[PDB]
């Protein structure tokens, strides 16, 4: 039993809700919140900009030190950093950016990072401002993630579409 409330069960291990991941994080304080990161950990907009704003820019300050030490992430890769006031940890995961010509096959690699964590609050990677179809992101999620994932979908219209077309 966990404290996620109001989620629609989609499969054995995937749950979904129309919500802002920032608000879900502030209410639940999960062990792991997933950020829809880019390779430079520049949290300007979308999920990343919203999460970083909620940390009063502490996420960005920590991220800049991470990059200065380690260099950029790989597309499909991830790193674990602090969750600040939103979660214990933030798993920064880089899905491919369709607008940059990046390989959508890397979306599966991106979701594989979730399997290193027993329970996560997460967005549909590569969707939103990253350019991919959220319906596709959801199918890759369900077919790749084996740990327990709670998805927060920001847009009500797309959520209803994601639910309606699922089975
Ligand atoms: O959910 C997405 C990605 N974008 C966000 N998701 C959750 N919470 C958020 N807070 C700010 C942005 C944001 C991907 C699926 C279709 C709708 C948009
Ligand atoms: Cl977005």
């Amino acid at each position: 039993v966990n404290s996620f409330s109001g989620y629609l069960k989609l499969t054995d291990n995937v749950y979904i809700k129309n919500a802002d991941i920032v608000e879900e994080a502030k209410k639940v304080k999960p062990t792991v919140v997933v950020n829809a990161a880019n390779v430079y950990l520049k949290h300007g907009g979308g999920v990343a900009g919203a999460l970083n704003k909620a940390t009063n820019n502490a996420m960005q300050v920590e991220s800049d030190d991470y990059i200065a030490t380690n260099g950029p992430l790989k597309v499909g890769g991830s790193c674990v950093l602090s969750g600040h006031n939103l979660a214990k940890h933030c798993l920064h995961v880089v899905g491919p950016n369709v607008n940059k010509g990046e390989d959508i096959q890397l979306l599966k690699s991106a979701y594989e990072n979730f399997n290193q964590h027993e329970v996560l609050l997460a967005p549909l990677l590569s969707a939103g401002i990253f350019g991919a179809d959220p319906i596709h992101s959801l199918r890759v999620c369900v077919d790749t993630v084996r740990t327990n994932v709670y998805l927060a979908v920001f847009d009500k219209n797309l959520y209803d579409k994601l639910v309606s077309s699922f089975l």
Side-chain angles (χ1 to χ4, degrees), residues 5-11 13-19 122 124 134 138 142 149-153 158-163 166:
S5 94
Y7 283 77
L8 178 68
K9 184 172 184 60
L10 293 186
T11 65
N13 67 295
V14 177
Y15 294 82
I16 200 165
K17 184 179 179 185
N18 171 215
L124 287 169
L138 176 57
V142 162
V149 58
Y150 289 83
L151 296 167
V153 179
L158 290 171
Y159 169 82
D160 283 355
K161 271 194 46 183
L162 287 161
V163 167
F166 182 73

Side-chain angles (χ1 to χ4, degrees), residues 13-31:
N13 67 295
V14 177
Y15 294 82
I16 200 165
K17 184 179 179 185
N18 171 215
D20 187 341
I21 197 173
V22 174
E23 295 303 322
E24 284 298 305
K26 285 199 287 189
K27 184 68 174 182
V28 175
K29 311 216 201 309
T31 303

Side-chain angles (χ1 to χ4, degrees), residues 2-3 9 25 37 47 56 60 64 67 70 77 84 91 93 101 104 111 114 126 136 144 146 149 153-154 160 162 166:
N2 58 51
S3 63
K9 184 172 184 60
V47 168
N56 183 44
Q60 191 63 67
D64 287 353
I67 296 287
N70 301 108
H84 300 275
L91 181 69
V93 181
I104 194 65
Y111 274 118
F114 289 26
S126 293
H136 176 68
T144 305
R146 299 177 299 283
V149 58
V153 179
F154 185 82
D160 283 355
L162 287 161
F166 182 73

